[PDB]
Each structure stands twice: as structure tokens, then as C-alpha cells.
Amino acid sequence: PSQDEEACVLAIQLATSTVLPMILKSAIELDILNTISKAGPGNYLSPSDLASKLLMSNPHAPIMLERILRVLATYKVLGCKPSELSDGEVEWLYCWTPVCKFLSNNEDGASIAPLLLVHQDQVPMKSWYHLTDAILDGGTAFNKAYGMNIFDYASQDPQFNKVFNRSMAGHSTITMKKILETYNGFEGLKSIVDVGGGSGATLNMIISKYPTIKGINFDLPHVVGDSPIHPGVEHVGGDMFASVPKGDAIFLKWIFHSWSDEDCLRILKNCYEALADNKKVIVAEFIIPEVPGGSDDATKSVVHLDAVMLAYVPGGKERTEKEFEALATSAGFKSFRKVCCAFNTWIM
Amino acid sequence: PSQDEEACVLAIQLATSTVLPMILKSAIELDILNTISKAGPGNYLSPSDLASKLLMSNPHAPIMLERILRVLATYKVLGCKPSELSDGEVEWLYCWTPVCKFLSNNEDGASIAPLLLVHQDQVPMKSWYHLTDAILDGGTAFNKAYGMNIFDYASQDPQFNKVFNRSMAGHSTITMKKILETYNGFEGLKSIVDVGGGSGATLNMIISKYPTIKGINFDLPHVVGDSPIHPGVEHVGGDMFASVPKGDAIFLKWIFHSWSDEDCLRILKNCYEALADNKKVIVAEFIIPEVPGGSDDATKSVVHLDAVMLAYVPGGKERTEKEFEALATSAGFKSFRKVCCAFNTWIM
Numbered sequence: 001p002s003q004d005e006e007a008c009v010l011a012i013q014l015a016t017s018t019v020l021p022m023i024l025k026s027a028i029e030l031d032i033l034n035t036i037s038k039a040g041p042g043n044y045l046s047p048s049d050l051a052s053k054l055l056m057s058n059p060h061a062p063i064m065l066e067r068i069l070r071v072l073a074t075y076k077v078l079g080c081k082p083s084e085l086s087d088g089e090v091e092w093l094y095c096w097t098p099v100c101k102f103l104s105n106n107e108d109g110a111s112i113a114p115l116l117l118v119h120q121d122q123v124p125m126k127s128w129y130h131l132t133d134a135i136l137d138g139g140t141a142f143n144k145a146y147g148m149n150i151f152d153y154a155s156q157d158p159q160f161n162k163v164f165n166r167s168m169a170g171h172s173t174i175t176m177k178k179i180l181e182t183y184n185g186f187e188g189l190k191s192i193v194d195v196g197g198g199s200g201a202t203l204n205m206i207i208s209k210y211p212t213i214k215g216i217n218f219d220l221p222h223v224v225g226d227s228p229i230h231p232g233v234e235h236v237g238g239d240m241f242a243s244v245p246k247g248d249a250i251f252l253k254w255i256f257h258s259w260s261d262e263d264c265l266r267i268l269k270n271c272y273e274a275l276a277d278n279k280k281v282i283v284a285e286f287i288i289p290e291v292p293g294g295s296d297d298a299t300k301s302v303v304h305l306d307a308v309m310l311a312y313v314p315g316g317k318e319r320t321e322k323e324f325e326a327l328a329t330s331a332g333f334k335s336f337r338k339v340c341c342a343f344n345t346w347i348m
Numbered sequence: 349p350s351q352d353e354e355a356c357v358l359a360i361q362l363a364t365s366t367v368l369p370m371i372l373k374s375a376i377e378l379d380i381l382n383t384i385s386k387a388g389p390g391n392y393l394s395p396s397d398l399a400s401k402l403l404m405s406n407p408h409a410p411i412m413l414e415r416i417l418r419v420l421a422t423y424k425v426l427g428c429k430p431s432e433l434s435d436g437e438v439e440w441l442y443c444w445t446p447v448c449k450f451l452s453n454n455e456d457g458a459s460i461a462p463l464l465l466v467h468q469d470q471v472p473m474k475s476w477y478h479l480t481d482a483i484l485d486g487g488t489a490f491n492k493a494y495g496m497n498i499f500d501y502a503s504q505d506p507q508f509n510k511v512f513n514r515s516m517a518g519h520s521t522i523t524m525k526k527i528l529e530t531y532n533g534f535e536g537l538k539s540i541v542d543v544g545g546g547s548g549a550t551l552n553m554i555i556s557k558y559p560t561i562k563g564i565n566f567d568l569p570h571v572v573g574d575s576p577i578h579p580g581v582e583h584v585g586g587d588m589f590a591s592v593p594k595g596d597a598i599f600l601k602w603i604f605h606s607w608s609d610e611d612c613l614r615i616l617k618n619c620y621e622a623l624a625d626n627k628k629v630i631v632a633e634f635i636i637p638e639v640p641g642g643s644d645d646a647t648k649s650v651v652h653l654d655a656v657m658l659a660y661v662p663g664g665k666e667r668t669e670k671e672f673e674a675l676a677t678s679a680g681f682k683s684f685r686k687v688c689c690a691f692n693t694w695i696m
């Protein structure tokens with residue numbers, strides 16, 4: 001009877017698992033995580049302390065926050081410790097964890113929280129309701145919801161544009177900062193073109209460590225025209241399928257997982273054409289493991305991403321290392337090399 | 349650098365965790381889980397076998413199913429094993445697990461899958477987008493989305509009514525079937541009133557084991573008028589706050605977690621009034637543990653439910669055993685007893 005109970009309560013848990021992303025979204029929107037980050041390690045807050053520090057006016061906000069805090073503790077975003085009340089009952093206090101750090105809006109702009117907000121946004125959320133139809137009828141879930149792909153939608157909705165670009169910028173500020181502690185590959189080159197570089201955050205972090213290097217942040221016009229400027233980095237609006245600006249190396253982070261094999265090869269030809277001989281194409285992506293049933297957080301992340309690609313973009317998919325090696329090979333490249341990994345992002 | 353990597357990839361995993369409920373919803377809607385249940389234990393299917401057995405017409409459905417299967421395997425809904433292809437590459441085959449059983453629509457009507465479908469339904473899904481407002485401004489997330497509570501909505505939307513009632517019926521068929529292997533409490537009584545019994549599934553399972561016992565399935569008119577009939581069980585339409593039909597015992601499963609303390613006491617007075625002296629009120633609910641940071645599936649389940657109550661219904665909440673004991677005490681009851689547990693549902 002013990003196996004049945006473990007299996008059934010897992011089923012119930014999975015059936016009510018929309019709670020996690022939605023409670024996380026609310027904790028971010030209520031500034032719970034930044035507030036706890038402000039308190040910092042080992043600084044425990046009761047639900048009442050947190051409503052007070054947030055200056056909330058709702059007399060029932062403390063009990064509501066308590067129930068949110070309890071969700072976050074179960075998913076290890078927060079720790080917690082008991083505090084004895086006068087009448088013998090126990091108050092539960094909650095505290096920072098390193099996870100909470102990555103989900104807080106660090107003044108440096110580096111945060112994973114905007115990534116949660118783009119996926120809970122009402123525009124991408126509707127694509128899931130057309131996924132079952134996409135499988136049975138063909139087509140792509142997102143385009144069936146909207147009659148246009150996600151990038152076309154962003155160009156027509158400035159609010160969603162900012163939400164999308166901020167989620168990418170937050171992630172790659174964190175990731176390139178840790179990448180740069182272990183990657184040589186930019187040291188000896190005159191210039192880098194970030195193809196689909198979004199808001200320029202990746203080059204912002206590359207040039208700040210290697211000034212003198214000329215950064216070319218290349219993306220669609222509606223993305224570059226709403227982006228801040230770092231010195232060393234010049235924004236170029238364009239279309240990577242039309243051409244790619246020339247440089248000493250080309251960089252593509254989280255590009256290929258959004259395009260079919262045939263479209264990846266079209267991007268890679270324009271990259272080829274844009275570089276001199278004996279030059280590099282630097283790719284940053286997750287990699288699918290050869291064995292699919294792992295339950296750790298790294299496998300969950302890349303598996304989540306592959307499902308996101310399935311609903312959001314035609315032909316998008318996460319790939320194995322052998323699948324990346326094949327693309328480079330088909331594109332006339334002669335050397336493929338997996339270099340290092342940071343926060344599940346490989347440099348290839 | 350190893351702690352930072354574990355924390356950041358957990359953050360990324362949590363930020364993209366809407367995937368799980370939404371991919372599960374699609375696997376249920378595509379009949380993947382019933383099909384695999386039809387194949388049964390140790391009967392491995394490739395993505396192509398599964399598209400064939402489902403008679404899908406989409407030439408890209410096999411690759412799409414593969415990516416869905418991989419999600420389900422990571423969350424342990426399915427197992428998987430490799431199969432070598434002719435050219436040395438490996439195909440991954442997927443197979444049944446006991447979890448898959450609880451998420452399949454067993455011909456007996458017992459399934460946890462309808463529970464997933466009510467929470468992913470577009471009507472409840474919109475309440476989350478008003479939760480942050482509910483905390484800051486007061487009110488209830490669901491009522492702020494719709495201007496009426498969830499039960500009023502069900503009475504005005506027959507489709508959502510059936511979706512809601514089917515999720516409760518599927519769960520309590522499974523739960524009462526296992527409860528009845530270890531509960532004496534119905535053996536020696538003439539009749540039971542199931543207050544808020546929904547579609548009658550719980551009494552259906554009680555009377556089928558104890559015929560001769562008279563079942564009174566009591567719920568709102570829009571619920572009882574769209575429900576099947578089991579012998580021994582008579583449906584009564586009414587309002588538990590107006591009165592409760594009299595009987596030898598009153599049964600309430602998943603009622604109290606939906607009402608504030610003051611409304612629970614109003615229900616309990618009507619239950620009190622409806623029973624003779626020296627008689628029982630039988631409550632089936634989850635119970636919150638005193639210590640809140642557990643990460644097992646039982647704690648996740650009750651924590652998920654408490655967040656669901658927070659967004660869906662005014663005043664709803666999961667409770668501790670001491671909180672249930674207090675309600676019974678305040679209601680004039682003289683004996684409180686936690687009896688047994690089944691699939692995380694306690695009988696009190």
C-alpha cells in the first residue's frame with residue numbers, strides 16, 4: 001500500500017503544479033524576494049515583518065504572505081525557522097537562500113526573475129492552449145494563437161517586447177558573468193558580432209572585462225531601438241537571414257534552439273560569409289543529454305526549454321552535442337569543440 | 349562555484365516550470381497516458397509506435413510526442429529504456445508507471461487526470477492574474493476576475509460545471525476506494541448525508557461496499573441535476589447554509605478547506621442540528637503539518653491546495669489538525685479524533 005500512496009500523491013502533486021510558477025510570479029510582483037534579499041542571509045522575517053517592510057495596507061496581507069512564503073520554502077526558494085509565541089504557539093520565520101538571490105532583481109540587473117515573468121505573461125501562456133491542436137493538426141501552437149510568430153508579435157506589442165528582452169538580458173548577465181571566469185575565447189580578437197544579441201547585455205559584460213574589443217550587438221530593429229548603450233558596443237538593426245555584420249568572431253547565444261535545422265544552416269552560412277578564414281563561431285546553448293530520464297535541476301531546465309521551444313516557435317528545439325556538431329559540419333565548419341559550461345549554458 | 353551552479357539552475361528550472369502542468373494537460377488530451385496504460389507495465393513504446401496507435405495524421409507528430417514523452421519521463425510519469433537502431437544510434441522507448449495509472453482515465457472513472465484539467469482550465473487559470481491585486485487591495489483573486497465566486501460561476505457555465513465536478517469525482521473515487529480498506533466508521537449506521545457530495549462518487553463507493561445503508565448526496569442544484577444515479581444514493585439539491593438533511597452521520601470531504609472559520613462554524617451548526625445526540629460528523633481533508641518546509645510530495649500536495657484555495661475561494665485554506673480540533677470544539681462537539689489517512693486525505 002506504500003507504493004500506491006507514493007504514486008498517487010505524486011499524481012495529485014503534479015495535477016496541482018500550476019501553483020508554483022503562479023505563486024512565484026506573485027512573490028516577485030509583490031517584491032517579497034527583493035525585500036528578503038535586502039534583509040540578507042540569516043535575517044529571518046515573519047509574515048508580519050514582511051508586510052510592514054513592504055508597507056502593505058491590506059489588513060489580511062500578513063496571513064496571505066504567510067501562505068505564499070510557505071510555498072516558496074517548500075520549493076527551497078526560502079529557508080525557515082520557528083519562533084515561540086507567548087502562549088506556546090510557534091511563528092514561522094522565513095529567510096534568504098542563494099536561490100532567492102538569483103530570483104531577486106539585483107541592482108546589477110542580473111536576475112532570473114524576469115525569465116519567470118515572460119513565461120507567465122498572458123501572451124505566451126495562451127500558446128499552450130493550442131499545443132494539443134498543433135500536434136493533431138500540424139502548425140505551431142503560438143502561431144495558431146496569434147497568426148504570426150513570437151518575434152513578429154514582439155514587434156507589434158511594445159509592452160511584450162520589453163518583457164521579452166528583459167528576461168533574456170537578466171539571464172545572460174548572470175550567465176556571461178560566470179562564463180567569463182573560465183573562458184579564454186575572447187581574449188585575442190579585435191571585435192565580436194553578437195547575432196541576435198537582444199538588448200546587448202552579453203556584450204555589455206564582454207566589453208566591460210575586455211575593453212578595446214569592439215562589440216557589435218546585432219538584432220531586429222524593434223529590439224535594438226529600445227535598448228540602452230554600453231561603450232564598446234554598437235547596436236545594429238537588421239535580419240540575420242539577410243546578412244550578418246562582419247567581425248573577428250560571431251557569437252550566438254540562445255539563437256539556434258529557436259530555429260529548425262534548415263534555418264540554423266541558413267544562419268550559419270551568413271556567419272561563414274561574414275568572417276575571414278581561420279575564424280570562430282562561438283555558440284552558447286543548453287545541450288540535451290543522450291539519456292532522457294534524469295530528474296535533477298539541470299535536466300529539468302533543458303527539458304523545460306525544449307517544451308517552451310515546441311509551443312513558442314516553429315522548428316525550435318534543444319539539441320544534443322552530436323546534433324550541434326552535425327550543424328557545424330553541414331555548414332562547412334571544420335572544427336567543433338565543446339569548451340565549458342556555466343549555469344547549464346555550454347560554450348561550443 | 350558548485351553551490352552557485354546548483355542554486356542558479358534551480359532558479360532557471362523554477363522560472364520555466366509552467367511547462368509541467370501544460371505538457372501534462374496535452375498528454376492527457378492526446379490520450380497518451382490511457383494509450384500507455386492500455387499497453388501496460390513493461391510494454392515499451394517508441395514515439396512512432398504511439399502516434400501509430402493513436403492514429404494521428406500529422407507527419408511531425410512522432411517527434412512532437414517524443415519531446416512530450418521526455419518531459420513526462422523526467423517527472424517520473426513514465427519510465428524509459430534505449431533501443432539500438434541499425435546505424436548505431438539509440439531510440440528511446442517509454443513505458444507505464446504506477447503514476448501513469450493514477451493519471452489515466454480508468455474505465456472505473458477513477459483518475460487524477462481530471463484534477464489537472466480543472467486547474468489548467470482557462471476559467472480558474474485567470475484567477476492567478478488577480479492574486480497580486482488581491483494581496484495589495486483586499487478581495488479574492490477569483491471574484492476579482494469574474495465578479496462572483498467559483499460556485500456561482502459553475503452554476504452559470506455548464507461546461508465548467510462538468511469539468512469541475514468530474515475532477516472531484518475522479519479524485520474521491522480513488523481516495524474512498526483506498527479509505528474503505530482501512531475505515532470501520534460506516535459499518536454500523538443507517539444512513540449518511542454527504543454534505544457537498546458533488547456528483548455522488550463518494551457515496552457511490554460507500555454504498556457499493558455497504559449496501560442497505562441509505563446514502564443522501566447533498567449539493568447545490570446545478571450539481572445534483574447533472575449527476576448520474578447509484579442505487580442506495582439519493583441526490584438532494586439545497587444549500588448547506590440553509591439546512592442540512594438529517595441522517596445517521598454527516599460526511600464532509602473537501603468542504604471546510606473552502607470556507608473561512610466563521611463559515612465552517614455555520615456549516616457545523618447545521619450539521620449539529622441535523623443529527624441526533626451521540627452521533628458523528630465525519631470529515632475528510634488534507635492536513636497542514638506543523639513544520640512548513642518539507643519537500644516531499646505529500647507536503648507539496650497540501651501546500652498546492654492551500655494556494656489554490658487562496659486564489660479560488662474567499663477565506664478558503666488548508667488547516668492543521670489543531671485547527672480542525674478547534675472548529676469541532678467551537679461547534680459544541682465533544683470528541684475529536686484523527687482516524688486514518690489515504691493518499692494524503694485524513695479522516696477526522
Ligand SMILES: Nc1ncnc2c1ncn2[C@@H]1O[C@H](CSCC[C@H](N)C(=O)O)[C@@H](O)[C@H]1O
Nearest residue numbers: 151168172196197198219220239240253254
Ligand atoms: N532575423 C531574426 N529573426 C528572429 N529573431 C531574431 C533575428 N535576429 C535576431 N533575433 C533575436 O534573437 C533573439 C533570441 S533570444 C535573445 C538571446 C540573447 N542572445 C540573449 O541570450 O540574451 C531575440 O532577441 C530575437 O529578437
Ligand SMILES: Nc1ncnc2c1ncn2[C@@H]1O[C@H](CSCC[C@H](N)C(=O)O)[C@@H](O)[C@H]1O
Nearest residue numbers: 499516520544545546567568587588601602
Ligand atoms: N451551499 C453551498 N455552497 C457552495 N458549495 C456547495 C454548497 N453545498 C455544496 N457545495 C459543494 O461543495 C463541493 C466542494 S468540492 C466537492 C467535494 C466532494 N465532496 C468530493 O470530494 O468529491 C462542490 O460540489 C460544491 O458545489
Ligand SMILES: O=c1ccc2c(O)c3ccoc3cc2o1
Nearest residue numbers: 115150254255258308312313364
Ligand atoms: O526560457 C527561454 C529561454 C530562451 C528563449 C528564447 O531564445 C526564445 C525565442 C523565442 O521564444 C523564446 C523563449 C525563450 O525562453
Ligand SMILES: O=c1ccc2c(O)c3ccoc3cc2o1
Nearest residue numbers: 016463498602603606656660661
Ligand atoms: O485540487 C482541488 C481540490 C479541491 C478543490 C475544492 O474543494 C474547491 C472548491 C472551490 O474550488 C475548489 C478547488 C479544488 O481544487
